[PDB]
Ligand binder design. Sequence first.
Ligand SMILES: NS(=O)(=O)c1cc2c(cc1Cl)N[C@H]([C@H]1C[C@H]3C=C[C@@H]1C3)NS2(=O)=O
Ligand SMILES: NS(=O)(=O)c1cc2c(cc1Cl)N[C@H]([C@H]1C[C@H]3C=C[C@@H]1C3)NS2(=O)=O
Ligand SMILES: NS(=O)(=O)c1cc2c(cc1Cl)N[C@H]([C@H]1C[C@H]3C=C[C@@H]1C3)NS2(=O)=O
Ligand SMILES: NS(=O)(=O)c1cc2c(cc1Cl)N[C@H]([C@H]1C[C@H]3C=C[C@@H]1C3)NS2(=O)=O
Ligand SMILES: N[C@@H](CCC(=O)O)C(=O)O
Ligand SMILES: N[C@@H](CCC(=O)O)C(=O)O
Ligand SMILES: N[C@@H](CCC(=O)O)C(=O)O
Ligand SMILES: N[C@@H](CCC(=O)O)C(=O)O
Lengths: 260, 270, 270, 260
Amino acid sequence: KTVVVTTILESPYVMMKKNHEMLEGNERYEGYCVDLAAEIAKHCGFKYKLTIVGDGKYGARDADTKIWNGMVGELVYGKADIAIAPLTITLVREEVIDFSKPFMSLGISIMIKKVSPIESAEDLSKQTEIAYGTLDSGSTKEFFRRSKIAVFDKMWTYMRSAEPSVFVRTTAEGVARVRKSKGKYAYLLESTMNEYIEQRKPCDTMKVGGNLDSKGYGIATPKGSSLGTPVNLAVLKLSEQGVLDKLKNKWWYDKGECGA
Amino acid sequence: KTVVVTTILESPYVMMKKNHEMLEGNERYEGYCVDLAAEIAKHCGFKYKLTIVGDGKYGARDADTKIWNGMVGELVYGKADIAIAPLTITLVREEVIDFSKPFMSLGISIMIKKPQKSKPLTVERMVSPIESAEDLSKQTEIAYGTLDSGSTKEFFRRSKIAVFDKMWTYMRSAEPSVFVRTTAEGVARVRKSKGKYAYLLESTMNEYIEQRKPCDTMKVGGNLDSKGYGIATPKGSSLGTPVNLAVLKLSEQGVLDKLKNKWWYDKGEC
Amino acid sequence: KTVVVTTILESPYVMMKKNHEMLEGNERYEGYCVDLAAEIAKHCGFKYKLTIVGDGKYGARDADTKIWNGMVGELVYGKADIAIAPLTITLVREEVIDFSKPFMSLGISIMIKKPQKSKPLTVERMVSPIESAEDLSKQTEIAYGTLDSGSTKEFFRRSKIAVFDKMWTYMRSAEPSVFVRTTAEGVARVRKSKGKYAYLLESTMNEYIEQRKPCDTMKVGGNLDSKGYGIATPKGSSLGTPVNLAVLKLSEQGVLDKLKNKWWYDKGEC
Amino acid sequence: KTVVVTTILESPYVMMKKNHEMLEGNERYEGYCVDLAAEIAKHCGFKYKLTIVGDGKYGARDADTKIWNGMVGELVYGKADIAIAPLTITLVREEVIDFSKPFMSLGISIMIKKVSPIESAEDLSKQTEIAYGTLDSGSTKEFFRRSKIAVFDKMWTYMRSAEPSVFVRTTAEGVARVRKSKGKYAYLLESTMNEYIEQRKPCDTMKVGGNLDSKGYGIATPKGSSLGTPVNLAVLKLSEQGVLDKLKNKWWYDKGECGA
Ligand SMILES: NS(=O)(=O)c1cc2c(cc1Cl)N[C@H]([C@H]1C[C@H]3C=C[C@@H]1C3)NS2(=O)=O
Ligand SMILES: NS(=O)(=O)c1cc2c(cc1Cl)N[C@H]([C@H]1C[C@H]3C=C[C@@H]1C3)NS2(=O)=O
Ligand SMILES: NS(=O)(=O)c1cc2c(cc1Cl)N[C@H]([C@H]1C[C@H]3C=C[C@@H]1C3)NS2(=O)=O
Ligand SMILES: NS(=O)(=O)c1cc2c(cc1Cl)N[C@H]([C@H]1C[C@H]3C=C[C@@H]1C3)NS2(=O)=O
Ligand SMILES: N[C@@H](CCC(=O)O)C(=O)O
Ligand SMILES: N[C@@H](CCC(=O)O)C(=O)O
Ligand SMILES: N[C@@H](CCC(=O)O)C(=O)O
Ligand SMILES: N[C@@H](CCC(=O)O)C(=O)O
């Protein structure tokens, strides 16, 4: 009985190698999440199959319908057994799926094309000359929707009432938008992906400010599943012997195809 | 019914008030941990009384007769219901108790007494004889110590990394023992050692001591490992889900961030 | 029963929202004044309807055919119940309506176009032809005027001081139509006058226009006097005491200061 | 029937004349408040007698007793008819006495001896080596006690718990304590008296930071008294014709025994 694993096409977590057209099975995928899934299977001792989520959405619940899309929907509705992917641990998602202990710390950061006048987030909210956006159906957008800090509510009020839409469909599309905006558009994304982008050639984007908050990535399992304890123990073990640190160093700093 | 909550006197997590001789109940203690417990009670209503573990240890797997001591030992054997205190999440601990989601990020850091400023146009510069863990392990002129019955000692004991293994090998044979009973003893040793002692401790406490007078000690390098603090609860308890949900609610509400800002950086004496 | 609340369209006190076409009720208007009305309704429970007076005037009294116009006229003759708007407290108005305690300080000032940077070691300095009110009265190469049917004209008309009386005499002697119907018209006259006109207005609006693009005007000198903005109710009304108490409570609670900061200094530029 | 006017001994509002031993009656008093009372009587048309408050307190309500002392006590208990004195208009005082329109704006300031490390109030609250105190039985003390702002709350916690008594009995005692503390003490007092002190020789004190809030001095009358409207319109008249400004300039800047 193989285990269906739901992932997303996001770098450096999952890459579609370079010759996927002439490869079969999981051998056509590479990345941090593929290595993490391999280690999880090695510790637990189960066969796994890598399946991409049908819709390129991390997961959210749409109001007035009460339905889930993406990996979270693929988990609550029994379409997959485990989600080794950069899924943010949030209060809403925990009520419907089980989150393991975080395996990668993260924070909300602001990145712009290459002293930067943006500086911190409050100045970005005050300065309306330069626009800022957020990935569609992500934890950042839901974080800003339910935020209560006055500055964060100002940012949310600006984003929900803007023309055209400041939101972006995919992270790569947001990177392209910020690169092609000549410093007129800003992107709010996770610290890990932003760092990976800023350490990659041509290196036309940089991180500004600090981290708005602190979150984490966890291995997701369906509610009431028997895999929660083994995957939690495996994540704890990997953190104890630093396999996660080695994987992050390999996939974030070993290549270093940038000037730094 | 009022449950038993256990804490340990570590500043700024749990500190005794100046006017505490006559006060009774939960009003005796003040700190970050008591505020976290108050917010936990506000989210899910329950009655709690602040207690301190008898031997004042975080909890370690004692060898030989296989006995758990300190906070974890109290939690396991039914004398405790929940521990709201800076207890790091550990695989060994996770196999023995249940841990909530990390409410505080942490890492192993290195402490050293701040050297005197170098005189050499006329600008003044600081020279750090210690920079990283590899250089600290390579040298022998400066001894280094850890906390007795602490998760840092467990991490060093079974670390496959060559530098960490060499460090632990030095620790086990070093005489007199560099291990200290309380973090206060370690900070005192660092202060009185004239710079000949490096006491490894969690990044949060190191930053707290740095921000506070007499601010004669400094934190060197980056975090060797990345870990977190979790609210402990005995296995097979119905209270784990409410505390996990309350921690998630507090983290998403920004209460934890403002509490950390007000307890670690608002009281900056240097 | 819903009472009538009359206001005046002055930024940032009362400005229509961009998407006001497809909205009805009080949701169309936004600014400092609507927030003050919301706090007033929160303190004392009542329903209010936001209305704009037909002639769009603050209030003045004719001498030959005595009649009160604008907001004060609306309040006196029973057409309105309360005016939560920047109405200056005046002795003449106090004899025809009831003013609560002031909720914002103010002062008569002078507006002038911002001069160009002076190139002539290499520094840039701001030099203005006007330094205070006395020089403006003494000089005759820059014309000045106030707002039509307002409190500033009333103050200048019956001022015994030599400088202000002389200014009023020139206001009757220059003989253009130096009095402007709206504050926006006077600001536009100052901006497009290339440096030939000075506008007298309240310090609050002066600062608001100063901190907003294209910011081609400066605040010169200091306030010629001190006045305030009060919530006005008709004489003999039972609502004067509740609104007075609500304003006092808001002032003690710091809500007024936070609204002033968020509507005057948190939206600035250049 | 002469009208009893309750005043307090506080400069420059009311000064006890140096020749008062040979001066009998209302002639023995001079100051801003004496001139204001003279103008009020000139407008309204009543005979006035200035009587100092028995106990040098502006006014407050005792906790667990519910009694009023000082000017407010002298007003609500029928001891005096009008209070022409620097009485701060506050929320709780208005419920028991009638306040007129303010005749002088004011704010909460900071007093220290002559780099200015303290600067603003938040930095004053951050630092502990230097202590700050206010005057008991006054608007500032009640405002600090009843303030709900976190920074003001921590200031109140500091002053309410300090040994010895950080509070002061009189404004002159406060400025003397500031002068003799060699910069180790801070006084939070009304901005008007702060300016008067800082412009008076030997000029060893100066104002730092900005005003924490905005209040006003008003003429006080007993609840239900008939003097409300006459004194209110008199204050409005005086403020409109600038006599109030002239008196302020005379009693604060005309002498100028300092260099500025
Ligand atoms: N350095 S990092 O961001 O790749 C990173 C971040 C984290 C790691 C491990 C690594 Cl390598 N483990 C912790 C978990 C492990 C065990 C101890 C704390 C939680 C449970 N979560 S974390 O603090 O989010
Ligand atoms: N800034 S901090 O170290 O006090 C801190 C650290 C952390 C916080 C919140 C704060 Cl304020 N919440 C996260 C939690 C939120 C959700 C994602 C990871 C856990 C579950 N853990 S954390 O990354 O260990
Ligand atoms: N800073 S400001 O001009 O917006 C401002 C000005 C004033 C405020 C409050 C604010 Cl926020 N309250 C006072 C009121 C409070 C009590 C004392 C005077 C009146 C009654 N009036 S004020 O001195 O005219
Ligand atoms: N220049 S000053 O501080 O002596 C001063 C301050 C003030 C004065 C008059 C003077 Cl001279 N009058 C106003 C009053 C007049 C009318 C408008 C606001 C109140 C009612 N209060 S005030 O803004 O507190
Ligand atoms: N990976 C995040 C989305 C990234 C973002 O917030 O922009 C999530 O699973 O919610
Ligand atoms: N926080 C650690 C103790 C500190 C240390 O070991 O350095 C624990 O809970 O075990
Ligand atoms: N605020 C003034 C009008 C503005 C002005 O005259 O400059 C009033 O209420 O009369
Ligand atoms: N004059 C003030 C007291 C001065 C102070 O606040 O220190 C009052 O009447 O309340």
